[PDB]
Write an enzyme that holds these catalytic residues in place. Sequence first.
Site, short mmCIF file in Angstrom:
data_model
loop_
_atom_site.label_atom_id
_atom_site.label_comp_id
_atom_site.label_asym_id
_atom_site.label_seq_id
_atom_site.Cartn_x
_atom_site.Cartn_y
_atom_site.Cartn_z
CD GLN B 10 21.02 -20.12 11.26
OE1 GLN B 10 22.03 -19.68 10.72
NE2 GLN B 10 19.83 -19.56 11.12
CD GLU B 70 20.06 -21.41 6.06
OE1 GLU B 70 19.61 -20.50 5.34
OE2 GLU B 70 20.31 -21.26 7.27
N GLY B 143 10.87 -22.15 10.07
CA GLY B 143 10.03 -22.95 9.15
C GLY B 143 10.49 -24.38 8.97
CB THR B 144 13.56 -25.94 7.62
OG1 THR B 144 13.86 -27.27 7.20
CG2 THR B 144 14.71 -25.39 8.43
CB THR B 178 14.19 -13.66 16.00
OG1 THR B 178 15.05 -13.60 17.14
CG2 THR B 178 15.04 -13.69 14.74
CG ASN B 205 17.70 -18.26 22.51
OD1 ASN B 205 18.02 -19.39 22.88
ND2 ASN B 205 17.61 -17.92 21.24
CG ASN B 227 24.60 -22.93 20.53
OD1 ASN B 227 23.46 -22.66 20.92
ND2 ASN B 227 25.02 -22.67 19.31
CD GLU B 253 15.71 -46.07 35.24
OE1 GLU B 253 15.90 -45.14 36.05
OE2 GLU B 253 16.30 -47.17 35.31
N1 LIG Z 1 19.83 -21.02 21.50
C1 LIG Z 1 19.95 -20.84 20.18
N2 LIG Z 1 18.92 -20.33 19.47
C2 LIG Z 1 19.10 -20.17 18.14
C3 LIG Z 1 20.25 -20.48 17.49
N3 LIG Z 1 20.13 -20.19 16.15
C4 LIG Z 1 18.91 -19.73 15.99
N4 LIG Z 1 18.22 -19.70 17.18
C5 LIG Z 1 16.86 -19.23 17.42
O1 LIG Z 1 15.93 -20.03 16.72
C6 LIG Z 1 14.99 -19.20 16.01
C7 LIG Z 1 15.30 -19.20 14.54
O2 LIG Z 1 15.16 -20.52 14.04
P1 LIG Z 1 16.12 -21.00 12.85
O3 LIG Z 1 16.92 -22.18 13.30
O4 LIG Z 1 16.95 -19.87 12.34
O5 LIG Z 1 15.08 -21.49 11.73
P2 LIG Z 1 15.52 -22.50 10.57
O6 LIG Z 1 15.59 -23.87 11.15
O7 LIG Z 1 16.79 -22.02 9.93
O8 LIG Z 1 14.29 -22.37 9.54
P3 LIG Z 1 14.37 -21.55 8.15
O9 LIG Z 1 14.53 -20.09 8.48
O10 LIG Z 1 13.11 -21.77 7.38
O11 LIG Z 1 15.57 -22.07 7.40
C8 LIG Z 1 15.14 -17.82 16.63
O12 LIG Z 1 14.34 -17.71 17.79
C9 LIG Z 1 16.62 -17.79 16.99
O13 LIG Z 1 16.81 -16.92 18.08
C10 LIG Z 1 21.34 -21.00 18.22
O14 LIG Z 1 22.40 -21.30 17.71
N5 LIG Z 1 21.15 -21.17 19.59
MG LIG Z 2 17.67 -21.32 7.93
#
Ligand SMILES: Nc1nc2c(ncn2[C@@H]2O[C@H](COP(=O)(O)OP(=O)(O)OP(=O)(O)O)[C@@H](O)[C@H]2O)c(=O)[nH]1
Ligand SMILES: [Mg+2]
Lengths: 442, 442, 430, 227, 41, 48, 80
Positions: B10, B70, B143-144, B178, B205, B227, B253
Amino acid sequence: REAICIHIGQAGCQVGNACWELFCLEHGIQPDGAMPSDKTIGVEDDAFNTFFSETGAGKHVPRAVFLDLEPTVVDEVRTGTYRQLFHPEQLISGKEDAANNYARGHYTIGKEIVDLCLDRIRKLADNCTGLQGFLVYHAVGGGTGSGLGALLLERLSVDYGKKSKLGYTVYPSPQVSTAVVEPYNSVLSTHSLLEHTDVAAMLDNEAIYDLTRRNLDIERPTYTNLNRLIGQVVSSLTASLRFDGALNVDLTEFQTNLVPYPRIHFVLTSYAPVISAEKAYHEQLSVSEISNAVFEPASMMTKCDPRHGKYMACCLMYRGDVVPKDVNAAVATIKTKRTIQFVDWSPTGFKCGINYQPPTVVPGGDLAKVQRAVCMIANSTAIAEVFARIDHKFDLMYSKRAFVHWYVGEGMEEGEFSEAREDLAALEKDYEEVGAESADMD
Amino acid sequence: REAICIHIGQAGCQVGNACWELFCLEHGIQPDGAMPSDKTIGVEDDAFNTFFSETGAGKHVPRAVFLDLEPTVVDEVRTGTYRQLFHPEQLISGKEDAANNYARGHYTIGKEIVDLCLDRIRKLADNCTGLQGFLVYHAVGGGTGSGLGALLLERLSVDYGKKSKLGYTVYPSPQVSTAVVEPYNSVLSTHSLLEHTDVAAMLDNEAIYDLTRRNLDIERPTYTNLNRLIGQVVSSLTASLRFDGALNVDLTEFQTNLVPYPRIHFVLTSYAPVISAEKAYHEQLSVSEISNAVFEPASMMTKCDPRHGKYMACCLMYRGDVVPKDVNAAVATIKTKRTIQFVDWSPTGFKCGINYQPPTVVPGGDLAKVQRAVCMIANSTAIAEVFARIDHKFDLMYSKRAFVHWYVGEGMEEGEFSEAREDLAALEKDYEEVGAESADMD
Amino acid sequence: REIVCVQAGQCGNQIGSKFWEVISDEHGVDPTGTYQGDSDLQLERINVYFDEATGGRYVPRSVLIDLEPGTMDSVRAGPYGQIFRPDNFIFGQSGAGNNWAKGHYTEGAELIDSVLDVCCKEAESCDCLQGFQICHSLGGGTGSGMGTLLISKLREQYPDRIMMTFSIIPSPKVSDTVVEPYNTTLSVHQLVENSDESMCIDNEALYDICFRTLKLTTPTFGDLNHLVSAVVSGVTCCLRFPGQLNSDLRKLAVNLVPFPRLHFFMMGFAPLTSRGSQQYRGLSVPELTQQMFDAKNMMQAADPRHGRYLTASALFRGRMSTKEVDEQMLNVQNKNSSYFIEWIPNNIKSSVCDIPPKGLKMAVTFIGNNTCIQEMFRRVGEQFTLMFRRKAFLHWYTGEGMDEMEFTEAESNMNDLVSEYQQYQDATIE
Amino acid sequence: MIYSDNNNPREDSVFLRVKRAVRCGGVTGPIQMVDFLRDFRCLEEEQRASGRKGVTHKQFVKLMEQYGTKLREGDAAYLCKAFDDDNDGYINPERFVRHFTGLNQRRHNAVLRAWASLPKDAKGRVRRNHLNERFSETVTHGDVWGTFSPTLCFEEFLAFYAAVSVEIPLDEKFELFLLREWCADSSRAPVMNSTLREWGQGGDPLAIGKPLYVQDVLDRPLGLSTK
Amino acid sequence: RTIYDALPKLPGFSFPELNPPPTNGIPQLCTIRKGIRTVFD
Amino acid sequence: RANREKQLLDYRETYQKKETQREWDLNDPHWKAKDLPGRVGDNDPRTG
Amino acid sequence: MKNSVARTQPVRKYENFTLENNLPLALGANFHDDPICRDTNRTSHTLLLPRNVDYAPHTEYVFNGGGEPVFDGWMTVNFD
Ligand SMILES: Nc1nc2c(ncn2[C@@H]2O[C@H](COP(=O)(O)OP(=O)(O)OP(=O)(O)O)[C@@H](O)[C@H]2O)c(=O)[nH]1
Ligand SMILES: [Mg+2]
Ligand SMILES: Nc1nc2c(ncn2[C@@H]2O[C@H](COP(=O)(O)OP(=O)(O)OP(=O)(O)O)[C@@H](O)[C@H]2O)c(=O)[nH]1
Ligand SMILES: Nc1nc2c(ncn2[C@@H]2O[C@H](COP(=O)(O)OP(=O)(O)O)[C@@H](O)[C@H]2O)c(=O)[nH]1
Ligand SMILES: [Mg+2]
């Protein structure tokens, strides 16, 4: 120059309908058997001769026979759109089917129809001056395709001599199935076909369904799509006889390069730019990309994985705008890969062909229009797994004499089961021994 | 010249949207990749080639893959504004998520999805001629992202070998949180990442929220702001490959200059002129002012204070209207400071880069327009404090096996928790040993 | 002093079409056969490659042989195809299948009498006959089998003339045919006994010429066949134009071959240069000599640095002084002395011809006899031994009728040839 | 053939048959093609006057049948869907015009150069009476004067010379044919040898004038034998 | 006659696509019949 | 060459439309929206 | 390169050049290296891309320099 096509049974006739639709549209013969109004003796126009002959009135008629024991499919051809294209004598039909029995086709029913087929093929061969082979389409899963195909190939092999016989064959899929008795018919067919064929190309409907789902965007494919892909592959292989090119390849060259030992004649086939119009605009389609495509097992039209074996020979056909340096660079890049392996006794593993005519596009088709394509036929030891999986199902069924009374009733000795099963066991041992490294053999 | 980007999960896909928005607008490719109807080429120069490839008809397509378990986020990309830019095969989506389980991503589901990802990345790598690294964006808290990112980096490390792999990683913030299971996933991720990554940049963050409150004037920030800042940082580091400059810096480098021992590859990142439009016209922004800014902890994108540790190496990238004499004077003044300390075994602590292209302005952006910027990545012993707090939270939960049955159910042995915990303890001891003065050990 | 050409198989017919285009251009013959040249110097030696027909026409002294007419129908339909005499096309009814035994024994013996009848009709018409020139590939089927059959018959019938061959040989990196080692080994066994001088070309070397020197973006077989047509028409240029130091095929053979088995040579052509570079370098004899010895400009995969030159020949076309030619050949021999066999006091012969090819101020063609050619034969013999131990694809050849003793003899003879090259490379005066 | 080779990738088989039918029907073929374009334009103008946004499928196939196209099963719907962009039962005029007068790149550039050679007036449109006497002896295909409605625009010009493109199978021959037809060869930048080239400062390989012999330099009288 | 063919026949000076063939077929200008070869045009 | 590939793209965009394919009645999305149930009301002519 | 074949090496300005402005190449006067004097900063792989040419060819190349009395009896004599 000339080649004669023999279409047998249901799959073979429907694929023949797709093939002749394609060959007509590529040469330009109208469905009523007429050259377009702009063609005259003004320019040299003879490329059709490989597949068509012209009558004294200038009508074109094709060098093919359609063989079936049931009337329905040939009556569909007789009542369809190409009614005026075919000569009515070419469409031969019996009264009743072989009911999924190889024994019924070979012994009971095909023996009555076979003499008409040999007389028609002879009447075609007398109207030729450079016949250089037969192309045969049949399925080994059904009764008439197996029995009459074997009987007719045996008779052709006795009458003609030193002539190539190339087969495109639809084998029973490893888990998709249509009839219970598929193993018996496939074993007895392969037993007869082993002695009387020079190269056999294998196709599986389950693989081409996967390819039409994966590459094209068709959710619910049907046999017409599969038949259009088969027509494209056959048109690609026979294009080398009909159009200008850098490196032509006669049908006799395939048998010389692909078959190392006389029993080892089963080859894999794949086609590169199987792509939809929407994907075609996201990608360039260079020589190296399609060359990389023909080696992925996701591109193959038979359900076998070549990573479980070793390649002995590959034949690569390029058609369209290609330059020899790119073909050489592509083949040299494939050779570097470590997950592609050749037997150590085959150092010069490749044969190349280059033709200038790009593939034709059919009005209702699903393939995109492309300037170049490559087609591959290859010999690999992985095929032993296909026979091993058919043989396990045969052993399971024969252990209980599951259906033997049908075969014995229609005229065949029970001994024929044991002979064929022993021949396939010996073929499995040939594929086991040929793959043994020479360094271990001392 | 070329680099391939891999976006996972995500955070990685959402940061990818901002990155590709910036790279398109900076090079000048339209959001759909097409060109005006009268031109023959959309742009006059090949500089885009580092990130985009053009087809023979001139459409542009980007060198990226988007990986998720997902569908929702990738379906948002498929239906958004950049629908025509990406090739549909590049946007890969599974059926169900890894449910915050590293075990579910690594053993059960990512193991099923990983071969499609490797086939797509291979198809990109075959269309390259001077690949010099992979850039990876993911979060280790989910997780992923953790499980499939680790598994994919392991497979990439075997297949591509020496090629560099640079990671941008979102680690769990020290007090903003989170999910409850963040420590287990972060420990197991760091265990896999130690062996299979060349440089890893860590982001939190909570630091970017602090930076957006103090410097920018945003009362209610959201992930799109963070982002866009991350995209600006990546654009600054990769600018050295794409535009003219006095001192270029190739991606190889960084690993040579920043990593003293093979395990010591985690670096801090900061960016200087993060400033709002109202402040930008009240202040001049000279080279020495932004050089003084990059060492203040208010400028960092990771929540760690470097005054509690020692620097081993610093890499300073300057872009825009800067003159080398001012960079040299600034770095000598920074070297004079007493709250900045280098280990006595690292006398030559700096690497410099100078590029002429100033930072691009994005239509909806919140940064002001400025003529120059500097970005720094540095290796420091202060990073040991982040691991100590993650390890303490892991120890608190693991003393009662608080959630282990999920991980054991999804395929992992209980032994893996203890192994990872001793490896992170050894990494803590490595950071204690590397920081010991040579004059003290005699 | 007229030469008769023979073109066999697909490669031979295609290279021949480009050769006859280049020769027709140099003598100003229209594709209708009418002379349209612009100097009497062109007409006075036209007999060397053309026979004279009665009206306003000229006919080329060439025999075309192939087992299936597809290639012949493509070349006859080409823009210069009309010049060829219709009775000179000899063809069968089924292809060679790239199999040596079929091409040599079944359809070979069927057509060879008609081919010999055409070759004798052409030879006995000449007032004085010079050597034959043959183009064919060694990896193919009708090229190898019928070419070597015809070469053997002409050596029985014309043992006092010269026998010269241009031959295409398998690349070391990528095969064009699976069964190349058998066809190559049997053909080299036939050639080393029958031939007087043989030139060998790798398509891979021509690809490297096109990519590195000419930087062509999209080369085609017409370019490779043009490079070959350029060198073949260049070696004979001194036979058909005046010059300060005449040379001849027999004199080249006498100066190049020290011992009768050592007759395999490398070829090169110098003024090759990319369209962008021509503004950067004027033509001069040192520039031609430097390109002449650069391995980038040599049409074989073997590199001179692993062997030694026994002899070499350079034929120069253009208006130039003999002093720079002689001193360049001396300077190259003196500066690279370790790469020249020391028991021969001078390895290079030079020749100078006044008339260059149109559009070039000067040109040179280079022929080289170097021991590094032994590594190519060693590679082919290795692949042959790998295939024979496992009887690879052997049933095709055995089914036509060949005795295996032929295979063991041909392998043994080629292995003795590599040993002989290795012994003379490391020989010393003592 | 023409719809299968790489040289003309825009061609389709069924549309080629339609063009063949409208050209060979029945006043020669190019005149019929210009008339077809004129009828399409007037029909779309009438429909725009009525208050409907374009020609429908039914009158399109009716027009094709009027010009004598022997259609088959499903090809009419194929063409109707091919030229319907918004998928609302209407035929896009610009796409149909672009496809109808389609040509290769070289042939299109030759037609453009020829058109740029002739003079125009008012709103970019030529008149027959001003130029019929000037080019009378050089225009071999006299049907051009019949195409004039004594006026003509670029679309009719392109349609006319796309009609004749089938008679010349070579692109170079087509280019030279058009250039010597309309005398469009540029004096500064020519492509044919039979033209009056003007240089301004002479050709650079100007080898004319001085044959440059060697005996005219040598001093012959010095060779006398005297003591 | 034209700038497209006013160059000498030297390597690198040939542009094959500038003279594209209008057709790609193989005529039968070379036949055997009953054993009497014909090379008719 | 560049204009050649541009015209090929034009051909693909205008003649190979998705709804043109012969098997559109099986692969069409919204295929259950355009069809009717087995019986409609009590005077449906289709219910023989 | 594997991009479109219509691309050509771009055109750069590099204004404020002393050698073009009737001035010596003095020390500390290399203005053409100042980034403000360029028109773009985009790096383009010129070593692989070809150059642009516009000209009207020569159409021809020269290689040579340009360069009844029957008796039927009836003998008659004329002194011309
Ligand atoms: N900087 C930033 N952090 C993000 C963003 N989206 C999620 N996070 C952070 O990343 C963590 C959540 O990880 P996710 O990316 O939601 O996990 P995932 O890859 O979807 O894994 P699954 O839940 O198993 O599908 C939390 O600490 C969120 O605050 C984003 O767009 N920018
Ligand atoms: Mg997810
Ligand atoms: N690809 C393809 N496979 C087909 C086609 N028709 C049938 N098959 C397959 O071939 C097998 C059935 O063989 P048939 O051709 O129906 O058998 P037959 O030749 O009619 O033999 P009889 O039933 O005795 O008349 C099944 O595996 C089918 O899936 C076809 O049109 N295309
Ligand atoms: N240089 C060159 N090589 C060619 C040409 N045509 C074929 N070859 C090569 O010759 C070999 C094939 O031999 P071929 O001529 O087909 O043998 P044949 O079947 O007996 O005529 C392969 O290595 C081809 O690459 C050509 O025009 N030029
Ligand atoms: Mg049936």
